[PDB]
Symmetry: C3
Subunit: 157 residues, 3 copies
Amino acid sequence: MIRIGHGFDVHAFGEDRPLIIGGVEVPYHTGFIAHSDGDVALHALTDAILGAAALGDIGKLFPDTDMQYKNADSRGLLREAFRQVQEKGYKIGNVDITIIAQAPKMRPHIDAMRAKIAEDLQCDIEQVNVKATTTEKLGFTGRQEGIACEAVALLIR
Amino acid sequence: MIRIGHGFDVHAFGEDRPLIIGGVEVPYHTGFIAHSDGDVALHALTDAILGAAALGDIGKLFPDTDMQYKNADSRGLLREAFRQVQEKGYKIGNVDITIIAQAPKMRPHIDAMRAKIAEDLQCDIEQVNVKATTTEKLGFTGRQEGIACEAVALLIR
Amino acid sequence: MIRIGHGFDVHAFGEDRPLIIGGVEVPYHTGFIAHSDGDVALHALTDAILGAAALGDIGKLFPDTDMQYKNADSRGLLREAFRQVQEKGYKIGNVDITIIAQAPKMRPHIDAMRAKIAEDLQCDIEQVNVKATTTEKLGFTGRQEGIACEAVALLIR
Ligand SMILES: [Co+2]
Ligand SMILES: [Co+2]
Ligand SMILES: [Co+2]
Ligand SMILES: [Co+2]
């Protein structure tokens, strides 16, 4: 039995002061803290993996309620989702990732990303590819307003 | 054999109108009528299944003409597409959909989304994962001009 | 064994004269020479192929350095890509491509496209799939500023 999975993330370059309306802290969305990192690369790959295993997404495993005081570093979330993944008897068949950013050149930091993702998934550098494209100056990634990332992963077990 | 598939759909919230030019009625684009529903989730997922079997896509299984007076419900189309997909000796391995929408709040209904797809795909909920993410207020999905969804498929049999 | 591979590529429609500042001729971005041939489909497919073998992406094997003089014919880069996916011992189990574009009518030339693809990818026609959608005038594609393509590819052996 094999599992196909897909994840997708977007995050703007700007920072936002937290929303307080009426004296109350109000989150902008469901898995807000889970995504605070802004690591589009590890979140997409996370929901990809989660999605194959058929477990929802970052927002169902890390609601802002449980994520309230727990550590929200994306790498750690990756790992925790891989725990639940393996928990259903699954090894990272293979994983492919596309970062979509116009500018911040990433070629330099790419093999280092694979390295880490490999460990977090307990597979090896070879079943983990990571690339980067630009939307050729178009769209919001192109106008340099944010950065995106798509991810696919195949699961074996 | 096992087959991978992918489909993508974008829809505006706005209601466009029957185009009538010089007497004649001009058909906006091809799978226009079938899409009119604007259910990016079901359409994209359908596109993924057809793509998996190299069956084409929604604009080829449902030209405006053929779709003209044939009832435009996109759930039957998904069924249909899947009917054509068994006729090739293909069963649904598993399915994974990402819905990209800002304000529209999907968490409540996602499980009822999951429910339906499985009947139609005659598969079991457990092999149908569904999810929503937002583009962090960026893009056309973030300015609230519309909605999108990517879907991925693994066909077995 | 099986490898999942995903690819994405965006192309603008305009051309960018070759730069000259202070005498010197300045190059634009890493893989602009490759992507110059503005063929979002063959490029998106190329990357999904490499993504799965895990050879990175075009601009990797074709740096604006090597390719300083290499030919901007996306079909060649595709065959070269399929070359390395052979060394590693890989067959094209299955491929699916989605063209996101607002107006050039693709539909009539799809089939012409799948042929060339099956050619360079040495496989059968029911092995390649090419579909085309619009984003209902939303985003940079619908504003007809550019064209984008998504590809997902399976590999065997
Ligand atoms: Co995120
Ligand atoms: Co649609
Ligand atoms: Co290109
Ligand atoms: Co994609």
